[PDB]
Structure formats: C-alpha cells, structure tokens
C-alpha cells in the first residue's frame, strides 16, 4: 500500500496574492486551530500505510490537512479567503465521509469545525 503525494504548496504559474482576509486565516484561524487538543490528526496528511487504511486514498482522492494549509497560507499560495476556506472544508467532507459518525476522529473533526466556523464568521470585510 502507498501513499499519494501531498497536494501541492508552490506553483509559480498559479495566480496568488495577499489579502487581509488571507492574513487573517493564517493570523487567527489556522494557529487557532492548530494549537487546539484536537489538532494533531489534521496537522499532516494521512499516512495510510502506517495506518493500515488502504481503501483511504481510495475513496478520499481530494485529501487536505492543516500542514498543507499551514504550508499554502505562508507561501501565499492563494488567490483569494474563498480558495483556502474551501480546503478547510474539504479536510472536514473527507473525514466525515471516511469514517462513522461518532468515531473519535469525526467528533475531533467537529469540534475543529464548529471553532473554525466561529472564525470565519467573523472574517474582516476586504481591504
Ligand atoms: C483515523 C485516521 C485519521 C487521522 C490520524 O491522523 N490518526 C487518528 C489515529 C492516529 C494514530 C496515529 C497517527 S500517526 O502515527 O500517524 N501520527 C500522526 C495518526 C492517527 N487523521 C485523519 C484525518 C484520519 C481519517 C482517516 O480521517
Ligand atoms: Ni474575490
């Protein structure tokens, strides 16, 4: 069993910019989340192989983590808040569609959503 590469980081040919909005996403969202207790399973991708879970990149074939994001905030790899809220939010879809509502991993997820949608409702208004 194997993993797949991490997504991408860098791309020169990807358009990408700074924006408060952005700032405030890596400023207050992700270290937010990042230093809670529930962190630690979402701060990299999903080693399936020393997990034993090789029906993973399987069915999730759209992976994100919190590293990747991390990684992409401090790059500057996005365009736009919208770009990288997405991404939050396919890190949330894919755990919740892997595995069983109650497993701990989805009850971490929850939690690690309901403080990141805390934060987005009050994403500051575009400068
Ligand atoms: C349930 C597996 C999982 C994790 C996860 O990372 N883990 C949950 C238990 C666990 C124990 C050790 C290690 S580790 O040895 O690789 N250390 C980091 C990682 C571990 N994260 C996500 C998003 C998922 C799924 C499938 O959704
Ligand atoms: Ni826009």
């Not at 400023?27 to 997990?51: E, G, I, M, N, S």
């Not at 074939?61 to 991390?70: A, C, E, L, Q, V």
């Not at 939050?88 to 939690?111: Q, R």
Request: hydrophobic share 35%; net charge neutral.
């Amino acid at each position: 069993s194997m993993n797949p590469p991490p997504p991408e980081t860098s791309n020169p040919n990807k358009p990408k910019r700074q924006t408060n909005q952005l700032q405030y996403l890596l400023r207050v969202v992700l270290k937010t989340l990042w230093k809670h207790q529930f962190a630690w399973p979402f701060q990299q991708p999903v080693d399936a192989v020393k997990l034993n879970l090789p029906d993973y990149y399987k069915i999730i074939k759209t992976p994100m983590d919190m590293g990747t994001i991390k990684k992409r905030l401090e790059n500057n790899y996005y365009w736009n808040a919208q770009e990288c809220i997405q991404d939050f939010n396919t890190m949330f879809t894919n755990c919740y569609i892997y595995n069983k509502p109650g497993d701990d991993i989805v009850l971490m997820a929850e939690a690690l959503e309901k403080l990141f949608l805390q934060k987005i409702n009050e994403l500051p208004t575009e400068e």
